[PDB]
């Protein structure tokens, strides 16, 4: 059950608090950052590719 999960998450919920967030590339429910709408794994790989502007590996 994954396409049904994604479709139900995209639909308008019955109540406002029913709504949750999923990663927009892979429909993953946990660990979704909401500046990027990306889960941690997709975030990491896209950041390594260089396709997320501004972000770079943090040395400090």
């Amino acid at each position: 059950a994954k396409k049904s999960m994604i479709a139900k998450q995209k639909r308008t919920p019955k109540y406002a608090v029913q709504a949750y967030t999923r990663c927009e590339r892979c429909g993953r429910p946990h660990s979704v950052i909401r500046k990027f709408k990306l889960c941690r794994i997709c975030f990491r790989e896209l950041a390594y590719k260089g396709q997320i502007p501004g972000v770079k590996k943090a040395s400090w």
């Binding site: 660990s31 950052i33 941690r40 794994i41 975030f43 990491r44 950041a47 502007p53 501004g54 972000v55 770079k56 590996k57 943090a58 400090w60």
Partner: protein, 97 residues
């Protein structure tokens, strides 16, 4: 009496844009106050490195915003026209008040 704020993710292209704006304003106008470096703002994102296990292995990423502020004191039609007609690079964001 004219304020310009420039923001970008790196200081090289933004330095070029600020210096170019100052040059054009000096050419077509009368006065300008040098670009004041506003503090950069950085945000940190810590992410688990593995796919399933291994809490103790992580990875930090960062995102920095660099800012500059410019003032033109003697505003003239030529200065405003030249400043508005500039073509700044993509990735540098300009805000004129």
């Amino acid at each position: 009496k004219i304020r310009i704020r420039l923001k970008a993710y790196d200081h090289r292209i933004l330095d070029q844009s600020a210096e170019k704006i100052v040059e054009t304003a000096k050419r077509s106008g009368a006065s300008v106050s040098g670009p004041i470096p506003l503090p950069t703002e950085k945000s940190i994102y810590t992410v688990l490195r593995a796919v399933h296990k291994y809490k103790d292995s992580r990875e930090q990423f960062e995102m920095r915003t660099h800012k500059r502020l410019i003032d033109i004191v003697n505003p003239t039609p030529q200065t405003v026209d030249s400043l508005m007609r500039l073509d700044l690079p993509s990735g540098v964001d300009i805000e004129i008040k």
